[PDB]
Short mmCIF file of C-alpha atoms in Angstrom, two decimals:
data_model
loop_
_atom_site.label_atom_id
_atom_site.label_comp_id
_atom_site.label_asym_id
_atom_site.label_seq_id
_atom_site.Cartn_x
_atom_site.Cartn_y
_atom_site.Cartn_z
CA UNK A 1 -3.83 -8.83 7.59
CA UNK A 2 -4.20 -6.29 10.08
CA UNK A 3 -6.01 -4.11 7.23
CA UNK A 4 -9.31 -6.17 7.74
CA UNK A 5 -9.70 -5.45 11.16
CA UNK A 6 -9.30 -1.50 10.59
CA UNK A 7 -12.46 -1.82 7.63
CA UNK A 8 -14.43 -2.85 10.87
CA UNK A 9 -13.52 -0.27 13.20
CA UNK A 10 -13.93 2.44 11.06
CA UNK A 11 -17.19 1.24 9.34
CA UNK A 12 -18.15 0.32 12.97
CA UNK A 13 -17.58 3.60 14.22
CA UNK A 14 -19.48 5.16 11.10
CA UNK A 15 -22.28 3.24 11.82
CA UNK A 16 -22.47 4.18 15.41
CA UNK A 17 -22.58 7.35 14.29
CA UNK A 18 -24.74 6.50 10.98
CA UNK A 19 -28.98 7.76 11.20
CA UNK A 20 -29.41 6.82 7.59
CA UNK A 21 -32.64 5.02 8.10
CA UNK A 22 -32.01 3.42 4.18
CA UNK A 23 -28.85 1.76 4.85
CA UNK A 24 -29.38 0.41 7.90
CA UNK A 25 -32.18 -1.30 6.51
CA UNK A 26 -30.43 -2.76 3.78
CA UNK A 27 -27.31 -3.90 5.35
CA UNK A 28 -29.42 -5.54 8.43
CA UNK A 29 -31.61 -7.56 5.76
CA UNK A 30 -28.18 -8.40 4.47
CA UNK A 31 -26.82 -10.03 7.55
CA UNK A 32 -29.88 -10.97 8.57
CA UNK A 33 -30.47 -13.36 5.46
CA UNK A 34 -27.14 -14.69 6.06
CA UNK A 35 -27.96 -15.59 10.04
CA UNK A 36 -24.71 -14.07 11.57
CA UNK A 37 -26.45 -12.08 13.83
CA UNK A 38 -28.49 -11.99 17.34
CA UNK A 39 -31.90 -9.77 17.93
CA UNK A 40 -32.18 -9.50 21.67
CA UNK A 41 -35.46 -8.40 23.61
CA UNK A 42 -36.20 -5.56 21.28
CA UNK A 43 -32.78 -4.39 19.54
CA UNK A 44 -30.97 -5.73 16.45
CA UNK A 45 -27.19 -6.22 17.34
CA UNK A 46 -24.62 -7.70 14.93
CA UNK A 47 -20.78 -7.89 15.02
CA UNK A 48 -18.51 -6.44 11.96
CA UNK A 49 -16.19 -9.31 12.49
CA UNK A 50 -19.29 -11.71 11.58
CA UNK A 51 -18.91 -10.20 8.00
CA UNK A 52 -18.02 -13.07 5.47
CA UNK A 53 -15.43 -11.68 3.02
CA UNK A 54 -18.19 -11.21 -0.15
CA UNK A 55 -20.58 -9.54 2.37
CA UNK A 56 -17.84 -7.31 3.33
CA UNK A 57 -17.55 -5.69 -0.11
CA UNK A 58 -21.13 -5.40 0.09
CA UNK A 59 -20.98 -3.66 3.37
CA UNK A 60 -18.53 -1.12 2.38
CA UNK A 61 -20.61 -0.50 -0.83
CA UNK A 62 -23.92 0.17 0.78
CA UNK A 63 -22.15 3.36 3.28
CA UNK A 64 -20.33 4.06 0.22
CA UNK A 65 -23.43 5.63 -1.29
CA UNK A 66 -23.05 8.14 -4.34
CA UNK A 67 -25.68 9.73 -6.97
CA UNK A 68 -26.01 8.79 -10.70
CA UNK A 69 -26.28 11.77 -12.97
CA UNK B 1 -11.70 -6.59 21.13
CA UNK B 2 -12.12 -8.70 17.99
CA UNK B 3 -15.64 -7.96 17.72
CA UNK B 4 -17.60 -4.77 16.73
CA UNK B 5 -21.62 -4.64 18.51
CA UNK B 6 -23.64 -2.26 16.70
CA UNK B 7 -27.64 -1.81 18.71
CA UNK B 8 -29.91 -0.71 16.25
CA UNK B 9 -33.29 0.42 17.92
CA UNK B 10 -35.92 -2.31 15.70
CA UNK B 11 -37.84 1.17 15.43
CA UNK B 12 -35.49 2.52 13.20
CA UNK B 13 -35.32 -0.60 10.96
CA UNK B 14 -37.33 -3.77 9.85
CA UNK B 15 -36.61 -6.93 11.02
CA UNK B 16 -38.52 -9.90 8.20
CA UNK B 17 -39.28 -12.28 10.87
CA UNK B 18 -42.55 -12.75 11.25
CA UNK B 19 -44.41 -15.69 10.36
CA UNK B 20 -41.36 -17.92 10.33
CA UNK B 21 -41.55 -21.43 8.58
CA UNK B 22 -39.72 -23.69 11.57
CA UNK B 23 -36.55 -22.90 13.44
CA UNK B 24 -35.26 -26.32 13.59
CA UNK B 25 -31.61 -25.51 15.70
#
């Protein structure tokens, strides 16, 4: 079980990291519909931890990008 | 630390908030 924790820190640190304007619009719309997060004065934090296990797979996907052809 | 804060200036992104139907707790 300590595997789940590690697909935070290193997605975490990748997204510290990440500038890709497109994901980080879809995954905050994605935790954002689900209501696990907390917008300050003007900033948009969320915790990794607050993923729920389907939304996880989806989180993974999205940085996980690729190219059809 | 069991918990991962990521600050994501709302200038980079899009927040869908803005006529909200009714917060209700």
């Amino acid at each position: 079980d300590k595997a789940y924790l590690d697909e935070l820190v290193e997605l975490h640190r990748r997204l510290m990291t990440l500038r890709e304007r497109h994901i980080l619009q879809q995954i905050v719309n994605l935790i954002e519909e689900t209501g696990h997060f907390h917008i300050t004065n003007t900033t948009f934090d969320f915790d990794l931890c607050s993923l729920d296990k389907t939304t996880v797979r989806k989180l993974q996907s999205y940085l996980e990008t690729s190219g059809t052809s | 630390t069991n918990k991962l804060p990521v600050s994501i200036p709302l200038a980079s992104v899009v927040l869908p908030s803005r006529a909200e139907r009714a917060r209700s707790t």
